[PDB]
Amino acid sequence: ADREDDPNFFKMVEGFFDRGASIVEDKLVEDLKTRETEEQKRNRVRGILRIIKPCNHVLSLSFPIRRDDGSWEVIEGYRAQHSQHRTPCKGGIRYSTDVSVDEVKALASLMTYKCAVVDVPFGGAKAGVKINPKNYTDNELEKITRRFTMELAKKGFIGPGVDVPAPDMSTGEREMSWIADTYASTIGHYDINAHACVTGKPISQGGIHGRISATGRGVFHGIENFINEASYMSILGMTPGFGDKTFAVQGFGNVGLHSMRYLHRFGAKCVAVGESDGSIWNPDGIDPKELEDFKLQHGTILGFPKAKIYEGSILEVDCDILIPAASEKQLTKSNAPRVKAKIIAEGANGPTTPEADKIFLERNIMVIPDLYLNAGGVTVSYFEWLKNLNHVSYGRLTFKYERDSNYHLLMSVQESLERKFGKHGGTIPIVPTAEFQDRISGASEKDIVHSGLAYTMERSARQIMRTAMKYNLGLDLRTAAYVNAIEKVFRVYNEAGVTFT
Template identity: 80%
Template sequence: MYRYFGELLTRGAGGVLASGYPAAAADSVLPASASLLRHRGYSQAVDPADDPNFFTMVEGFFDKGAAIVEDKLVEDLKTRETAEQKRSRVRGILRIIKPCNHVLSVSFPIKRDSGEWEVIEGYRAQHSQHRTPCKGDVPFGGAKAGVKINPKKYSVSATLPRRPALLGDPCGPGIDVPAPDMSTGEREMSWIADTFATVMGHNDINAHACVTGKPISQGGIHGRISATGRGVFHGIENFINEASYMSQLGMYPGFQDKTFVIQGFGNVGLHSMRYLHRFGARCVGVGELDGSIWNPKGINPKELEDYKLANGTIVGFPDSTPYEGSILEADCDILIPAASEKQLTKSNAHKIKAKIIAEGANGPTTPEADQIFLERNILVIPDMYLNAGGVTVSYFEWLKNLNHVSYGRLTFKYERDSNYHLLMSVQESLERKFGKHGGSVPVVPTSEFQARIAGASEKDIVHSGLAYTMERSARQIMRTANKYDLGLDLRTAAYVNAIEKVFKVYSEAGLIIT
């Protein structure tokens, strides 16, 4: 039932461009960046039909970043080796970082309502175990999972989600920690946690940390549901308020008077829309599979959410008109593809009118489209940074589960009392100095400070931690872009930044023994 595909090192970083030209002739017809990739043995990994699979896209973006950062990694390597030996070591480590380390495939039976039995397949890919448990870089090794099924065609049955929890050793609080994604949520995560705790973790006090995105009553954390959309907002915020980037786009900093369009009105799209609307941007269009709506005066996110809950669709939303054509090509300042991968390709990249593309979905832009956007001076805020809000707050939930106490519980009352004592001390000091005959000099906090005096709730701490994480990561990407003179190529800057961090762990933690 369990089949390991093993270490996929054959998919290393040693591929070269397929071409009928001799090497020198090929370099002469390729752009400088492509020539650099070829010279260093990295593959561009771009499908001629511009329809690569997601893994191939990531490999191509990795290769582009690796080619740029290689010289710097060689220069910073502190070993007693020749320059050629150092370069060989760097390239070897990059080849080890690039492939997916393990893929686990499971098959399990379910009984449908009709009485028919069906075999369902599931997968878990652990890209890297350089830091465990496997979970997006927070700061762990990356992993992803999926079950090959359309949940809309099956009835709710505990039999279905409980089977993947019986993976045994590959999963656990210190090994691999899944989280919700498309077509899954709190319910499914609760099922997995309960099954793991019952079957595998009955002697492990941390068993419920085996998965994140759970309901609050099952060890979840406040702010997790909206985390990805809130992260999208913070990611856009960090770049839209940066004058140096906005000047290159011919725009003024800030959200005021900015228009945006969202493709996909699921969890990510809804919460992204909600926060952008709250801070002054105007949503003029929303697209879904069954249709798109348009209103240049603005669409209210709460009203649209209520309408969809009542009708099961956004089509026919009052005060809006159906949008003919692709909503991706609508006129706006910010485009947020928050649906599925490969929505922006070379076939429509020239038609995009937005000046900022904020990738709320995973892999919405193909490599060829990405290159077209760079040539057109369009700022693409990459998915690997922008939609990391969910996994960041999942990390906070994992820490909460290991600590067995909610954020703020141990300090909430102490901080509140300390703040009030501070105000009383200030008031008494003023009265002694300026009060007439012991008259009162009241010290009254502002409404904003009053809210903070009350003490930080778990949600406040989560929101603050997420905002700080997104800001810190944005600054790292900006510094990397400036350091390597990448201009608006934030995707390559993000990959370079990630490669540098993972390379440092591999080099210094003894993961490479020679």
């Protein structure tokens, strides 16, 4: 998208890592309380850091499918497993003609660090199939997905205990259903956990409430934790809260649409929505329900009645918050000086080059990094995986017990008070509030997903802020996130003896 500043994607992520490694290297050496206090301490710390960076296993595939017209075609595919310091590996499947070994390796490493940031016990992985799904029938896409699943399974690149895929660009519920069905019907036929081989499944198939919207929901929570922190909003020259703010959204897919829904719900105003074919704009606000309904009907956002076909880059629209939610390397050395927003919330994976990060720093623009902000997807995938391993819906064993227990608890307060203020205090009814009445039976699956996600995004934001203050990083939240990720992954490699050697 830019021939001036177009770094190799894997190496760009390695650069981000190098930078966080630079900052913590002292802390790692000093923690290390080995008798070698000689600066082979320094040496073993940077030997371990070199082990963490490259992907351990990458599988490249070519397999034939026969198209609906009868033609034979060769499909190309890839899956990278970056780290196995936690198992299984976790990461999505991308259907796109931009798929390549380097793109997949880069996203696989992002998954490792992202999972470490939100304390999700998975190593990183990613897959890609180099096709444009719009050029294939549904029957052909099913054939490609099912065959890809078996080629991965034959070589140990999918399974509930090694590698658990998930949706990404141009895949969703539908593909995940296909993956889970052919895994469970063949190699997983005797495995009690066969349907935990993949997440993002439909509900009828072991999916979890809110997985489709989960990463949008997490984008809201990530922004909210920082947009409500007066210390960061001072440096930006902006007022805490959502009620008065504007935002623009690049990409109207699963991440972009649901980020818009939740931000709109809490008083922000969507001004611009950009897509693969063009952009639309309205300074008075775009309604997400109307835009979705139009998009579902016409297969495009152009021509939306209540906004005007906007020319020029969606990334340079004037707004408070820019949400790049499409592909990677969209903000570069070129357009970074014209961005006009004061908060960049990366919903997409790797939308900002390192050169663009430098410009944004100089310019007091806050980039909330992908490592943290889009990790709501993998957090709720983690909940889905646990739901599959546990083989019950949350609360089903305890709803009645817990309901009865709570009423007897409140009755214990009632009877204790009547016992004391006897006859002429009268009857002293203790009853639930409206809000407690609605929790009287304990959490359900929906409650766990919402509160578990909010808990994770908040706990992770505080850890990033703590680390940024400690090292005087200002608005370089990306380096603070990598610092936390590196510290966690380093400790695992260090206390494990590294490897089987």
